[PDB]
Design a protein around this ligand. Structure first.
Ligand code: MN
Lengths: 173, 345, 151, 173, 173
């Protein structure tokens, strides 16, 4: 039951100080395995509130979020405003099932408060602004896996997959 | 054709096309490509008989048939896939019209005929155009539309993003005879949509386009608003915000004149700026010029409109019809505003 | 009619924006534009043309990098006192006068090339003051707009 | 690496004086695996000079001649009238390719001058007069590959595909 | 009459010393009619060696190298390293076809020794970095047709024709 941490990718520059040790297990659920990123985690009924970018629990099935499932601990001080839960690894809804199966998985979802006073008219916003892609591969896609930009220079196979596979919901409110 | 089918055949297909490309004679070239199949057909053993000597010939015969007829050959799958997305877009625009307090006289697939108040017609045109391409922001009932598809509770059905849709708004008095109103709306659409041309960029080269216009008329005032600015209207996901990106410019400008930040003189002042803004070939000069045309007619401390500078030099034209239309999009914007505001008379 | 004037307000210009560099006697060009235009169409073209030539001498580097803007591009008309930077507006008027055939480049060129003929050039202008003031109207108002827009 | 040999299937008996020993390596590319000949190879832009059978270098994309990659060496003193080469088996036109991929082939193939005085009017050819099909089964299908007429008397399953598949471009002049 | 010859066009240097008789006869097959480089020669199987620039062939039809056909007698001393071929131009692989020819010609193509002691691994190296088409437009685009720099100010047009048209396979050895 190796502990992993779910991290997502919004357009914001907000996924920087979230996982101090980007590792903490003996493998990675996700894998860039010559075809691009594979085994992405999808969760239904949530949305990323980009200001303090974290998921938010709503009830609408129209709303979904996608992010790379990686290993690590939640800042060694969280579970106050973060999320801490476990999973059997079987009920999951995976994109491009190509990686391992843990069969028991404790993860940590970056999470936010409801603040039930503003009506959350949510919109769908996929990745745009290619510069954010190119400095995201620098910020996160190099600090999670040293194989990125050391063994392979062919980073284009995750570049287009960032725009094609990472689509979340923006509240913009 | 290259772009349909990711698989392992795309390279095979583009090699077939390299064959077809430059009229390489009948199977006098397929020896370049049959390899790319015969090396692969022998990855499987349960394949009963050997039939790779001719199928590679029929493949390029079909591809040459397409490329030489100049059109994708139609099949019933094509037709059902189209005319189902057509009814889905129907279901979408139905809930769109009702959102803007409209009244749908008829709306079947491509067409539409609704009566709306003159206040939510720009908003409606923007939303309906972007939704016809299959790109929106809110859910429209159970049809949760997403960047070129229509997500019904995890089911992705396609849409018509490559198809152009025109509009014909008539701002009519409530007492005008509906006979002539309907005739003029139909006539403006069916005629203007085929007689006016605007500067569109095709493969980084300015050409002329015909369709995707919004033809407003108000008892003698006309204006045309392009909605494509790219002749293949969408080839990526970056295009889905360019859709009707001028109607929101006109909207921004309408929400400055309501707030009293800009004066309505802005609409009776652009002429003494167009004669200089059209003879110009410098972008960063036209930007200053429009800022000064807006600066001179603003009422608050410092308004910010910042026209998107891809509209400069857009040249609308006509094949000598009784329709009078300014030959620049930036003036059609002010004429559209004059029409809208005459609608609140 | 004067639709070609809005292109002439550029092909004459060729630069008065950083050829007039250092933001001093550059931002003075808006003053030129507004005040000079108002005064040409209240006082007259002659009372203003005298006032303009008074701020720019004859047979000097002023004339040099003034006629240089007839067959060249790089003419940095630098100088703090508006005398090389006052020939900006003088060149503005002269380029129009020549490229609209109001006066001919023969007479003008040959006239600003020896002292005997500047008197005759000025008298010729005096004979064409109404025509010039009427025609150059839009061409100048265009530069009064171009200043408050760009300059 | 396993050094091989290349000879084609002409409508003349110019195959006999081409090779000293039928074998001499460890295995072959071309195989017969109780389903007929596997691993046939074709080369583009050439043709046979049926008299003194060799290869003529043309440049027509239509040109192609089918030959067999046998394991041998053509008389131990050629590479002056036969071509010397090395292909890594990643660039072979291997029909019915079922056998192993040696991934580095050193091959000897007939190759001489075109004698560019006349137009190389090269036309297709079919192996008719099935008596010659039998005789050629006696020619190479037995002398090179001994395994025939011992493990299977059923040549009628392999006698027809020799006429079907083996077709090339013949100079006929 | 019109004894033609071939010239390959890779991005590499040592192409202007390919021959000594450049213009040769009255004209060539290739022509630039102020719209595009017409009748461009591509060979299916030949590939250029990176040292001692010439075309060494590879049995895979997927191997190809492009170029143009000129009319001339190479150096008055070659044709001992250049394959002379006699084809009717009906078997000629010409691309960007414009018209027709007298239907009987003769070509001298640069063919190189195979170097069998190394395998034939070819990769598609294409034309870019227009400084690399500069020494083709000044050296071997003028020398073939001195009509350039006279009425055609459209050397940018032929620059783009080269940009979109020319590629090859390199052995890189
Ligand atoms: Mn019609």
């Amino acid at each position: 039951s190796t502990q992993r941490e779910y991290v997502f990718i919004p357009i914001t520059n907000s996924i920087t100080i979230d996982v101090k040790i980007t590792i903490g297990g003996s493998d990675h659920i996700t894998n860039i395995d010559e075809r691009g990123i594979h085994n992405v985690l999808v969760i239904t009924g949530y949305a990323v509130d980009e200001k303090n970018g974290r998921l938010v629990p709503t009830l609408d099935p129209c709303d979904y979020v996608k992010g790379i499932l990686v290993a690590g601990t939640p800042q060694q001080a969280q579970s106050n405003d973060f999320l801490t839960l476990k999973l059997p690894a079987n009920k999951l809804y995976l994109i491009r099932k190509k990686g391992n199966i843990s069969d028991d998985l404790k993860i940590y979802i970056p999470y936010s408060s409801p603040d039930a006073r503003n009506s959350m008219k949510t919109k769908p916003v996929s990745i745009s602004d290619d510069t954010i892609v190119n400095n995201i591969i620098k910020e996160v896609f190099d600090k999670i896996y040293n194989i990125t930009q050391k063994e392979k220079v062919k980073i284009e196979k995750v570049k287009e997959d960032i725009k094609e596979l990472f689509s979340y919901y923006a509240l913009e409110q | 054709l290259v772009n349909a089918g990711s698989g392992s055949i795309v390279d095979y297909v583009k090699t077939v096309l390299k064959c077809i490309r430059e009229n390489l004679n009948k199977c006098s070239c397929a020896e370049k490509i049959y390899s790319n199949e015969v090396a692969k057909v022998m990855f499987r053993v349960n394949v009963e008989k050997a039939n790779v000597e001719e199928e590679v010939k029929n493949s390029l015969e079909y591809f040459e048939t397409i490329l030489n007829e100049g059109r994708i050959i139609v099949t019933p799958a094509w037709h059902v896939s189209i005319s189902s997305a057509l009814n889905r877009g129907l279901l979408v625009e139905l809930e769109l019209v009702n959102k803007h307090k409209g009244f749908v006289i008829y709306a079947g697939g491509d067409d539409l005929l609704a009566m709306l108040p003159v206040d939510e017609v720009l908003d409606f045109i923007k939303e309906s155009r972007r939704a016809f391409a299959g790109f929106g922001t809110e859910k429209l009932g159970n049809m949760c539309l997403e960047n070129g598809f229509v997500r019904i509770n995890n089911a992705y059905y396609p849409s018509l993003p490559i198809v152009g849709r025109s509009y014909s708004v008539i701002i009519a008095h409530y007492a005008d005879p509906l006979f002539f109103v309907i005739n003029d709306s139909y006539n403006l659409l069916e005629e203007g949509k085929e007689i006016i041309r605007y500067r569109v960029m095709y493969n980084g080269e300015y050409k002329d386009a015909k369709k995707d216009v919004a033809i407003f008329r108000y008892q003698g005032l006309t204006s045309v608003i392009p909605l494509s600015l790219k002749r293949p209207i969408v080839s990526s996901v970056s295009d889905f915000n360019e859709i009707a990106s001028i109607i929101d410019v006109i909207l921004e400008l309408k929400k400055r004149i309501d707030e009293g930040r800009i004066s309505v003189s802005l609409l009776y002042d652009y002429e003494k700026y167009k004669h200089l803004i059209v003879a110009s070939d410098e972008k960063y000069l036209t930007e200053f010029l429009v800022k000064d045309w807006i600066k001179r007619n603003s009422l608050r401390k410092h308004v910010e409109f910042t026209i998107d500078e891809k509209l400069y030099g857009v040249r609308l034209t006509i094949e000598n019809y009784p329709i009078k239309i300014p030959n620049d999009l930036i003036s059609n914007i002010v004429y559209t505003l004059r029409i809208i505001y005459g609608g609140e008379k | 009619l004067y639709e070609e004037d809005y292109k002439l307000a550029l092909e004459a210009f060729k630069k008065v924006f950083n050829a007039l560099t250092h933001y001093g006697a550059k931002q003075a060009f808006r003053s030129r534009a507004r005040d000079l235009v108002e005064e040409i169409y209240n006082s007259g073209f002659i009372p203003t043309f005298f006032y303009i030539i008074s701020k720019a001498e004859l047979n000097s580097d002023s004339l040099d990098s003034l006629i240089s803007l007839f067959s060249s591009d790089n003419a940095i008309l630098r100088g703090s006192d508006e005398n090389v930077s006052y020939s900006a507006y003088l060149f503005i008027i002269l380029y129009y006068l020549i490229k609209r055939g109001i006066i001919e480049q023969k007479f003008l060129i040959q006239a600003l090339r020896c002292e005997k003929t500047r008197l005759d050039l000025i008298d010729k202008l005096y004979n064409l003051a109404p025509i010039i003031s009427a025609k150059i109207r839009t061409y100048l108002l265009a530069i009064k707009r171009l200043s408050e827009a760009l300059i």
